[PDB]
Amino acid sequence: SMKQDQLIVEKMEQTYEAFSPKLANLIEALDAFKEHYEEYATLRNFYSSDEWFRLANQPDIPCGVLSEDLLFDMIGDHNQLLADILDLAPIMYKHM
Amino acid sequence: SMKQDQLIVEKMEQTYEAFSPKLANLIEALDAFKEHYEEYATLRNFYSSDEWFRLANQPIPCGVLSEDLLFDMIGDHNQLLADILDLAPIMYKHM
Amino acid sequence: SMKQDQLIVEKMEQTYEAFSPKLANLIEALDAFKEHYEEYATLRNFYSSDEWFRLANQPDDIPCGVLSEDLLFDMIGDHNQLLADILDLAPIMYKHM
Amino acid sequence: KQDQLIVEKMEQTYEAFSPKLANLIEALDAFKEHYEEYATLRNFYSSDEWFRIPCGVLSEDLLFDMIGDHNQLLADILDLAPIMYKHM
């Protein structure tokens, strides 16, 4: 029936409108993350380095980059993001 | 010694402050995309169905029955998968 | 106890022995696949070419046969399914590092 | 007759390549079949029980190197995936 057709299309339209910005936002966020990736590389190599440890043992006080957890947590976040991405890839592959 | 240190630190701090929100934003955007994925599944199965074609070819559609709205959405999804597959090995080397 | 320890260890040793070569073989097979990947690329681009279709409708017929109806299609299908399996495996391996 | 030349080349390319695909497929799925053994060995290595003539599984490096090999295989797989994705 025509009215079924109408309902069905209106429902799809609303579904598109709720979904599409989520796709656009992930695309944009991924791209920006990629553009700034060297900053993560720099910060990660800084944290491993002997220099970091030297500087973390100053005599004030450590809240940022020399903090106990800041950079460790950033890396933890990065690594957990990688997991989430790895879980998503096979699902996306089955919906191409 | 304690002025050169300050300058090294100030550079790192600035690097963190430029970078960290990009990480947070990607985390959040990924999660929201995941949460709404079934909507993409639904739309994708709608587009490939005979019903879509019947509905689209009736007697103009700028939405879901338009010529390329959903095609482009799938195209965008598929290109996002490619970018994700390129990013994974890079991230795997910086854990 | 020492005897019980020895039996636990023997079980692990066997587990290593059963498993280790499956790792080593996959590593070797992967590498060889990578090395020969251009052969797949060539064959794939041949199959999707207009030339393939022309040549498949000629009267040599039928070799069974790079010009066969499904040889190269199946090879691509196998490649694609291999990518799926790889994608499913990656997250599992990521949780056992 | 250009044709027969071209075909012969492809046929030879297929015959060189196809077993490399089959072998990877078969190696992958045998690795899958036996994955729980890797899991068990990995959890064994990290355990308190493990602290306890030793050249095999109780060796300094055997299990460490196995994990190292596993982890490098993952890297190689992650590199391969995007390439395969462009040739479907």
Side-chain angles (χ1 to χ4, degrees), chain A, chain B residues 1-21 23-95, chain C residues 1-21 23-97, chain D:
Chain A
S1 78
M2 177 175 287
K3 180 81 191 169
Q4 263 172 342
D5 289 354
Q6 288 171 338
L7 289 157
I8 296 332
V9 165
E10 238 311 285
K11 182 146 98 204
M12 287 306 174
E13 224 76 278
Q14 280 159 239
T15 298
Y16 184 82
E17 209 179 309
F19 174 69
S20 67
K22 305 222 170 53
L23 176 59
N25 289 342
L26 178 44
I27 287 169
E28 172 166 35
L30 185 78
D31 189 76
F33 184 81
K34 197 226 276 173
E35 280 286 296
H36 292 228
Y37 198 77
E38 235 154 65
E39 296 166 5
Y40 167 81
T42 299
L43 292 162
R44 173 183 175 267
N45 291 351
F46 180 64
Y47 177 61
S48 353
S49 81
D50 288 340
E51 304 283 353
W52 190 84
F53 177 57
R54 192 187 88 28
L55 280 59
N57 306 47
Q58 293 315 71
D60 206 52
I61 71 119
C63 226
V65 162
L66 300 169
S67 155
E68 181 66 358
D69 315 324
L70 193 73
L71 294 188
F72 182 87
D73 287 357
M74 180 191 68
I75 293 175
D77 287 356
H78 173 273
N79 294 349
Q80 174 59 51
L81 175 61
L82 178 50
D84 289 326
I85 279 173
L86 290 181
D87 287 347
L88 185 57
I91 288 165
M92 293 186 137
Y93 192 78
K94 297 280 192 27
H95 299 79
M96 294 185 299
Chain B
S1 161
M2 211 120 158
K3 305 176 199 260
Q4 285 169 144
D5 289 354
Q6 173 201 336
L7 294 158
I8 290 321
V9 166
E10 278 172 326
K11 181 157 169 210
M12 288 303 93
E13 228 60 21
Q14 190 158 240
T15 299
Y16 185 82
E17 82 207 315
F19 174 70
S20 67
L23 176 58
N25 288 347
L26 179 45
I27 286 168
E28 185 42 55
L30 177 68
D31 192 74
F33 186 81
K34 282 187 148 173
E35 173 142 286
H36 290 232
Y37 199 77
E38 278 152 17
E39 295 168 3
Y40 167 80
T42 300
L43 291 163
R44 170 182 174 272
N45 289 115
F46 181 63
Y47 178 60
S48 62
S49 77
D50 290 343
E51 300 302 285
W52 189 85
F53 183 80
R54 186 171 62 69
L55 289 166
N57 294 106
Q58 269 171 8
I60 137 119
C62 266
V64 303
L65 299 169
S66 74
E67 181 66 67
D68 31 54
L69 192 74
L70 295 188
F71 181 86
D72 285 1
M73 178 193 69
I74 294 175
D76 284 358
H77 173 275
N78 292 355
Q79 175 60 48
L80 175 60
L81 180 50
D83 291 325
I84 278 172
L85 291 181
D86 280 327
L87 183 58
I90 287 163
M91 295 185 63
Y92 189 73
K93 297 288 149 204
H94 301 84
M95 293 187 301
Chain C
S1 158
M2 271 182 77
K3 196 200 187 168
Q4 289 161 345
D5 289 354
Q6 179 215 52
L7 292 156
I8 289 137
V9 165
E10 236 311 285
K11 190 115 190 53
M12 287 300 98
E13 220 77 61
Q14 336 228 272
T15 298
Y16 183 80
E17 252 162 71
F19 173 71
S20 169
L23 176 61
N25 290 345
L26 178 45
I27 288 168
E28 159 268 333
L30 177 68
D31 186 72
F33 186 85
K34 280 200 282 173
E35 214 84 88
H36 289 31
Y37 199 76
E38 280 320 303
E39 298 166 6
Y40 167 82
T42 299
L43 290 163
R44 172 185 173 270
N45 294 62
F46 181 63
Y47 177 61
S48 62
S49 76
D50 290 341
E51 305 76 300
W52 189 86
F53 191 52
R54 185 180 77 67
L55 296 140
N57 303 322
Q58 277 196 22
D60 198 302
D61 41 17
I62 303 153
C64 262
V66 136
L67 266 25
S68 72
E69 36 193 356
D70 32 53
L71 193 73
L72 295 188
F73 181 86
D74 286 357
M75 177 193 68
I76 295 175
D78 285 358
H79 173 276
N80 291 355
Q81 173 60 49
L82 174 60
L83 178 50
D85 289 324
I86 278 172
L87 291 180
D88 285 341
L89 185 56
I92 289 164
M93 296 182 67
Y94 192 75
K95 302 183 222 276
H96 299 81
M97 294 185 19
Chain D
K1 189 265 189 169
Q2 285 321 140
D3 293 353
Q4 87 103 316
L5 190 272
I6 291 321
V7 165
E8 236 312 285
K9 180 144 78 248
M10 286 301 95
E11 272 288 357
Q12 293 206 278
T13 299
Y14 186 82
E15 312 314 317
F17 174 71
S18 66
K20 303 307 166 216
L21 177 58
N23 286 346
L24 180 45
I25 288 168
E26 50 177 291
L28 179 66
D29 93 82
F31 184 83
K32 281 160 67 163
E33 197 198 326
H34 292 232
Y35 200 76
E36 278 318 306
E37 297 168 1
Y38 167 79
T40 57
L41 291 162
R42 171 181 177 270
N43 286 356
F44 179 65
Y45 178 57
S46 58
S47 77
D48 292 321
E49 196 81 277
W50 194 81
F51 287 103
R52 252 129 71 67
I53 355 196
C55 278
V57 36
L58 301 168
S59 155
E60 210 188 303
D61 314 327
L62 191 73
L63 295 187
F64 184 86
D65 286 357
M66 178 193 69
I67 294 174
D69 288 355
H70 174 275
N71 293 349
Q72 176 57 52
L73 174 60
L74 179 50
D76 291 325
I77 280 172
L78 291 179
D79 277 318
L80 183 59
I83 288 164
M84 294 194 219
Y85 189 75
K86 295 288 149 204
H87 299 83
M88 295 186 299

